Amino acid sequence: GKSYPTVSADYQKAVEKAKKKLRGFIAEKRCAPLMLRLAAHSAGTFDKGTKTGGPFGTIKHPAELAHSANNGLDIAVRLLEPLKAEFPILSYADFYQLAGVVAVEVTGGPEVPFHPGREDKPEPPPEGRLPDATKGSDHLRDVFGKAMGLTDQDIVALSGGHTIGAAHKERSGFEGPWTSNPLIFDNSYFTELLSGEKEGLLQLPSDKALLSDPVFRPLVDKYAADEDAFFADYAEAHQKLSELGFAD
Numbered sequence: 001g002k003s004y005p006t007v008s009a010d011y012q013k014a015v016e017k018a019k020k021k022l023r024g025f026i027a028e029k030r031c032a033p034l035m036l037r038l039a040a041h042s043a044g045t046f047d048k049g050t051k052t053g054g055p056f057g058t059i060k061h062p063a064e065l066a067h068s069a070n071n072g073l074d075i076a077v078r079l080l081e082p083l084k085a086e087f088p089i090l091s092y093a094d095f096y097q098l099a100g101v102v103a104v105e106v107t108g109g110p111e112v113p114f115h116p117g118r119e120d121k122p123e124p125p126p127e128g129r130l131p132d133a134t135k136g137s138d139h140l141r142d143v144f145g146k147a148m149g150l151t152d153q154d155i156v157a158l159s160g161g162h163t164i165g166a167a168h169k170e171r172s173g174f175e176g177p178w179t180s181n182p183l184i185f186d187n188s189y190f191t192e193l194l195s196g197e198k199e200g201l202l203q204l205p206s207d208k209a210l211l212s213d214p215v216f217r218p219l220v221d222k223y224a225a226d227e228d229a230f231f232a233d234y235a236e237a238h239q240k241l242s243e244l245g246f247a248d
C-alpha cells in the first residue's frame with residue numbers, strides 16, 4: 001500500500017553515506033540496541049484512525065523524551081546529533097529510522113529495506129500510546145493492531161527486537177538482557193522464552209504474553225525452530241513499523 005516520495009539525487013547520496021557512517025559509529029559505540037529502541041519505540045506512537053504520531057522525528061523533542069516510557073532515549077538522541085549534523089539534508093525522521101535499520105544489520109540481522117522521504121513533523125503525539133511491558137496479549141493487539149495497524153505475525157516478529165539489548169532499572173525499572181548474546185541479532189529471544197526463566201536473563205510480562213496466546217505461540221515456536229523464518233518475518237515487520245503513516 002506504499003507510494004514512496006521522490007527525493008533528489010543529493011538526498012539519496014546522503015542516505016548512502018549516512019548509512020556507512022552509522023555502521024561505523026554504532027558498531028564502535030556498542031549502541032545498536034539503544035538505536036533500535038529509539039527507532040522502533042518512536043515509530044510505535046502511530047494511530048491509524050487519526051493518522052497522528054509515528055516515525056516523524058518528534059522523539060527528538062524534549063517534550064516527547066520526557067515521557068517516562070522514553071527514559072534513556074535522550075542518550076540515543078544526543079549520541080546521534082554530531083553525525084546527524086554531517087547530513088543536514090536528511091530529515092531527523094529518516095535519520096532515526098536509518099539508524100534502526102543499521103542497528104539490526106551491524107548486529108548480524110536481516111537487511112531491512114529502507115526508503116527515504118519522511119518529513120519531520122511539528123507536534124509530538126500525546127503520551128500513553130507505547131506498548132506497556134506490564135500488560136498482555138489484549139493490550140499488544142490494542143497498540144500494534146488497533147492503533148498501529150500491524151498484524152499478529154508482526155507483533156511476535158517485532159518482539160524479537162529484544163534479542164539485542166537489555167532493560168535498565170533506572171530507565172524502565174526492569175533489568176538485564178533478554179539473551180546471553182545481547183549484541184548479536186539472532187532468534188535467541190524465542191529460544192530463551194521457550195526454555196523457561198534462566199537466571200540472569202529478563203522476560204517482561206509482555207514477552208511472556210506471547211507464550212500463552214493461541215495465535216502468538218505458534219509464531220514463537222516457528223521462530224525458535226527456524227531463524228531464517230524469523231529473519232524474513234522480522235525484516236517485513238520492521239519495514240512496516242518504520243513506515244507507519246509514511247507513503248500511505
Ligand code: HEM
Binds near residue numbers: 034
Ligand atoms: C512488544 C512491545 C514492546 C514492549 C512492551 C517494549 C518494552 C521495552 C522495555 C520495558 C525496554 C527496557 C528499557 C530500559 O529499561 O532500558 C525495552 C528495550 C528495548 N526495546 Fe522494546 N518494547 C516493545 C517493542 C519493541 C520493538 C518492536 C522493538 C524493535 C523491533 C524493541 C526494541 C528494543 C530494544 C532493542 C531494547 C533494548 C534497549 C537497550 O539495550 O538499551 N522493542 N523495550
Ligand code: NA
Binds near residue numbers: 181182186188
Ligand atoms: Na541475541
